[PDB]
Amino acid sequence: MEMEKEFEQIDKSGSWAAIYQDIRHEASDFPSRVAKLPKNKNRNRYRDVSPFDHSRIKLHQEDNDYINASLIKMEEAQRSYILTQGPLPNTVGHFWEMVWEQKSRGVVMLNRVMEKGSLKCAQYWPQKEEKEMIFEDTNLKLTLISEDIKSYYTVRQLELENLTTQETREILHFHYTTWPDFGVPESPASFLNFLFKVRESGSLSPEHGPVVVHCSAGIGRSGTFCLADTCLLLMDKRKDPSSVDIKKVLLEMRKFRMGLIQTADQLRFSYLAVIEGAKFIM
């Protein structure tokens, strides 16, 4: 079925939970043996969210190459994404090592450091120009260059220096600051505006390594972001845009990381975002 009328048909019939449970039943199951090794316990935030072995990002280290991060490679859309958890106190150096080694231009953050009165990820970037951060375990230096605070999101320019080689690179930090502590946003307008700002920066384009996107677990809000981006790109590429099937795209993405889209409300919100976004594109 088309999307917008499939949408109204699920609303009128109140069957979002049944649709979402079907997706959960059909989703791929692949091994995640490296994630479960005892030496990696303090590298995982949640015991039930792990990268598959076949698609995990490897650190360029011989001691321990493990990080909780997955490469989502979308062949028809010609887009790739790295989805990862919010960094932990003992993985902030690994996080920036990955950004460096994978040649990423941008980092997309969809959570606040504290939500619901609890810490959802480490404070992993500097807040003042004159107070830079040094990660001694991976030999990197990170400096805040500029910050632009808007009503729904903040964009930061950062400098990452590999202290071994003295090479430097500019990284863009796109921080969506207004996702509610509970539920999903009422309108997709600010989320879509944010997606378009990331696009306009070059961070999603083939001349760079894959964008790094995270929330707390790296599957819910993060899944909404890449699912909406890929569906909109396919609607531009194809002769028949009504052929784009958001449930099929989501199941394709779940071949590369488990659990993408965590609730039936997130599934409905993803439909809404693609529907509204397809009208603005034209």
Ligand X SMILES: COc1ccc2c(c1)OC[C@H]1CN3C(=O)CCN3[C@@H]21
Annotated binding site for substrate: 181, 215-221, 262
Residue 265 binds ligand X (CB under 6 A): no
Q: Tokens 């594109």 label which residue? A: 281
CA 186 centroid distance within chain? 21
Q: Which of residues 150-189 bind ligand X (CB under 6 A)?
A: 189
Residue 275 binds ligand X (CB under 6 A): no
**Of residues 257, 185, 183, 202, the one with CA closest to residue 226:** 257
| Closer CB to ligand X, 106 or 277, in the complex | 277
CB of 228 to ligand X, least distance (A): 10
Which residue's Cβ has the minimum distance to ligand X? 280
Task: Name the burial class of residue 90, with classes exposed (0-12), middle (13-18) and buried (19+) by CB atoms within 10 angstroms of its CB.
Answer: exposed
Contact residues for 20 (Cβ-Cβ < 8 A; gap 6+): 261, 263, 264, 267
Segment lying near ligand X (by CB under 6 A), choices 49-57, 130-138, 241-249, 272-280:
272-280
Please say if 215 is a catalytic residue: yes
How far is Cα 274 from Cα 280, in angstroms, rounded to an integer? Answer: 10
How far is Cα 212 from Cα 2, in angstroms, rounded to an integer? Answer: 31
Among the listed residues 74, 142, 155, 192, the single contact to ligand X using CB under 6 A = 192
| Closer CB to ligand X, 124 or 174, in the complex | 174
Binding site for ligand X (CB under 6 A): 189, 192-193, 196, 276-277, 280-281
